[PDB]
């Protein structure tokens, strides 16, 4: 009856940004009050809708994308942005309708000595299309000489671990991100507010 936002926002494990997770939300009641009655979210912005009116809205389907990046990169989770994350990992369309939510997760995703399980794609031949997901692990040929399955100069592996230490600067600390996409189809609305 009520939409399972707890499985998304309160999940104990989050995906790497290059392999970002998507959950479809449908046929339920959406109560976004948890976004208001909380001084814990660091980013809560919407595009195409008013963020204070979410409980008054209905949609055919809602899609929740979640992943971890570092604080300095949260600004790239927006339409028209540029950078490693927006270009190679997770890109929003220009006509994006939905909301972007983020919060500091240093207490969950950083470890003494460092947590390196979260990865991001560092090299790619071209930018992603909006909502495209690339999980390939081909050696990146930076130069003109083929690599022949061997790494070295101008032959790199495309993924790179984040280095999340508890004592990192807040810009280098891990942040958990949730992107809500609102979809309208020629069909009855199955995700409404209270």
């Amino acid at each position: 009856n009520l939409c399972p936002f707890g499985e998304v926002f309160n999940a104990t494990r989050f995906a790497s940004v290059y392999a970002w997770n998507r959950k479809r939300i449908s046929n339920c009641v959406a109560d976004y009050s948890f976004l208001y009655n909380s001084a814990s979210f660091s980013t809560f912005k919407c595009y195409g809708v008013s963020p204070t009116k979410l409980n008054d809205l209905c949609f055919t389907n809602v899609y929740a994308d979640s992943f971890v990046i570092r604080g300095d990169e949260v600004r790239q989770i927006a339409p028209g942005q540029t950078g490693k994350i927006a270009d190679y990992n997770y890109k929003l369309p220009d006509d994006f309708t939905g909301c972007v939510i983020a919060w500091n997760s240093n207490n969950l995703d950083s470890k003494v000595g460092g947590n390196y399980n979260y990865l991001y794609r560092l090299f790619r031949k071209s930018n992603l299309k909006p909502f495209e997901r690339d999980i390939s692990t081909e050696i990146y040929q930076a130069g003109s000489t083929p690599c022949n399955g061997v790494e070295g100069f101008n032959c790199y592996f495309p993924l790179q671990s984040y280095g999340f230490q508890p004592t990192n600067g807040v810009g280098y600390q891990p942040y958990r991100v949730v992107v809500l996409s609102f979809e309208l189809l020629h069909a009855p609305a199955t995700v409404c507010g209270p």
Partner: nanobody
Amino acid sequence: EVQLQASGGGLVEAGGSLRLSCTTSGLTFSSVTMGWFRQAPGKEREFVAAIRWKFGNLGYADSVKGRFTVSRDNAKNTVYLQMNSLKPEDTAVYYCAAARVGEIIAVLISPSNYAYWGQGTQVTVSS
């Protein structure tokens, strides 16, 4: 308390061969990318070879490709560098190096991607 201990090396003639080994203590070796660098007297430290722990790829400097072979035995916490067809320009101090536990490093040739360094082993190839 993380320690890298190397064995092998020494003096050979041109065309000879060697085998270096490097054993770690205090690390989960099976989740650590291992590497070999070298430094000639007066010159800068340069990349030689590397072997990944998760994605299996090997890495080699262009000058040693085809002559050197890097390998690893996780059960013995050991990484190996077989150096065949040695040239005089291979003379240097060779350093074993290790990245961090679970870390996925993209660029194998960058020394800053390795956190633990061995003491170094002399390799001389004359005439």
